[PDB]
Amino acid sequence: SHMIITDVEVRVFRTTTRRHSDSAGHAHPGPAHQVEQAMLTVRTEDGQEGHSFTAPEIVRPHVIEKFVKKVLIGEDHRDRERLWQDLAHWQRGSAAQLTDRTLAVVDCALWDLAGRSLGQPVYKLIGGYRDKVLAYGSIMCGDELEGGLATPEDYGRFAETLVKRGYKGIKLHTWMPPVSWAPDVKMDLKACAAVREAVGPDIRLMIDAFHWYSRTDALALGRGLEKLGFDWIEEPMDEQSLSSYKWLSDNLDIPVVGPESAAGKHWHRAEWIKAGACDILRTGVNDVGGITPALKTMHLAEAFGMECEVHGNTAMNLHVVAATKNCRWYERGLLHPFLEYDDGHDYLKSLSDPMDRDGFVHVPDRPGLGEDIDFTFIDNNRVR
């Protein structure tokens, strides 16, 4: 009975960061401040543990007591498919409180537990494809900060810096409300043009613009991009409208990648394939409810001969990318000229995603998700 789960614990602590998020949830650099972060730990009878990080609200007591403990406590931690399906089955009746985000953090902690228990990196447990992978530099949403990301030329200048660092691909997130004047298709296209001019024709370029443009605006945006040789256009319209995506992909030459944010996990992504709503699939550990369903989406895409690009940084997504073939990149970011991504986080002793000078991220040879957790730091900065 050593593999039986005995405890599920949440520890909330303060991390020091210059990352802020606006009222619409878009990241920006700002003053150094303390932000509450949560760590979920699952422990078995023999004392082995697995951990994963998320925002405090996602693993608050209501959700832990009503849902997570009831599924996990007393169960064999290795039964990840059974445990995931049990949580999935309870979402419909949860009064909207048991979210895909909660499933993701629980599933990730279970994977970390298995890996740490076995002394194996998660991607090796899954079945490894690659130990290193090209990353694109994923640039934060636009701002109104002088010298930051306020003008089209600001994007161009930051792009030059990213190429020097070794990134072989660059993705722009452009300007979005509550930036006062946003959104503006002409401004987005000017940023795209400035970046292409700055880096030349051989760096791969992507755009993830305002996520709710009308069909007419997204068509104008996509048309403007075809002149610049961009690799993909990402979520330019409300992803709840599958029909809009069928229409847009039919009317654009540039590949459309999606859905990133849409609900329904791997099931809904099958619908995007069936309906021809995208040219490249998208998934992400946080978006589909864990490593387990992310892997399902990767396999789904592969069976159709499609790529499936993995949204988001951190170990959980990196291990999905390392375990699969049909994904061009790891998404490294979000990045901003004012911030030093390579410095990492105060609660981790080293980076989960170190990148060489040629633009390859190397998966750490550490067990589980391989997050090098500074438990002492967390203990010293607990939220009472």
- Contact status, residue 10 vs residue 38, Cβ threshold 8 Å: yes
Residue 376 interacts with which of Cl ion, Na ion, a copy of itself, none, CB < 5 to 8 Å by class: Cl ion
Q: Counting contacts by CB under 5 A, is residue 56 touching Mg ion?
A: no
Angle, helices 100-118 vs 80-91, to 10°: value is 170
Give yes or no for a contact between 235 and 208, defined as CB atoms under 8 angstroms apart: yes
Q: List contacts with Na ion (CB under 5 A).
A: 208-209, 211, 235, 249, 276
Binding mask 230-249 for Mg ion (x = CB under 5 A): -------------------x
Q: Give the one entry of Na ion, a copy of itself, Cl ion, none that residue 211 binds, where binding means its C-beta sits below a cut-off of 5 to 8 angstroms depending on kind.
A: Na ion
Q: Minimum distance from CB of 323 to a copy of itself (Å)?
A: 6
Q: What angle do CA 340, 12, 380 make, to 5 degrees?
A: 75
Among 49, 131, 144, 260, binds Mg ion (CB under 5 A): 260
Q: Kindly list the distances between the CA atom of residue 171 and the CA atoms of 24, 158, 175, 344, in Å, as whole numbers in the listed order.
A: 20, 11, 13, 20
Peptide bond into 56 cis (omega under 30): no
360 binds Cl ion per the rule CB under 5 A: no
234 is in an annotated binding site: yes
By CB under 5 A, which span of 49-57, 223-231, 238-246, 346-354 interacts with Cl ion? Answer: 346-354
E strands in 237-339: 256-258, 280-283, 308-310, 330-335
Burial (CB count <10 Å: 0-12, 13-18, 19+), residue 379: exposed
289, 331, 378 from 284: Cα distances, Å: 8, 10, 26
- Rounded Cα–Cα distance for residues 330 and 349 (Å): 21
Nearer residue to a copy of itself within complex by CB, 185 or 323: 323
Residues paired with 100 in a beta bridge: none
Q: Which residues make up the interface to a copy of itself (CB under 8 A)?
A: 76, 78-82, 85, 118, 120, 124-130, 266-267, 269-270, 274, 292, 295-297, 299-300, 302-305, 323-325
| Least Å from the CB of residue 305 to a copy of itself | 6
| Residue 17, SS3 per DSSP | strand
Rank residues 148 and 183 by Cβ distance to Na ion and give the closer one. Answer: 183
Count of residues that interact with Cl ion, criterion CB under 5 A: 10
Q: In angstroms, rounded to a whole number, what is the distance separating the alpha carbons of residues 323 and 210?
A: 31
Least gap, CB of 131 to Na ion (angstroms): 31
Distance CA 211, CA 138 (A): 16
- Write phi, then psi, for 29 (nearest 5 degrees): -80, 145
Kindly tell me which of 211 and 332 has the beta carbon lying closer to Na ion. 211
- Report whether 208 belongs to an annotated binding site: yes
Number of residues that bind Mg ion (CB under 5 A): 6
Residue closer to Na ion (CB basis): 40 or 209: 209
Which one of a copy of itself, Mg ion, Na ion, none interacts with residue 266, CB within 5 to 8 A by kind? Answer: a copy of itself
Which residues lie near Cl ion (CB under 5 A)?
60-62, 335, 341-342, 354-355, 375-376
> Residue ranges for the binding site?
208, 234, 249, 252, 260, 337, 345, 348
> Residue ranges for the binding site for Mg(2+)?
208, 234, 249, 252, 260, 337, 345, 348
Which residues lie near Mg ion (CB under 5 A)?
208, 249, 252, 260, 344, 348
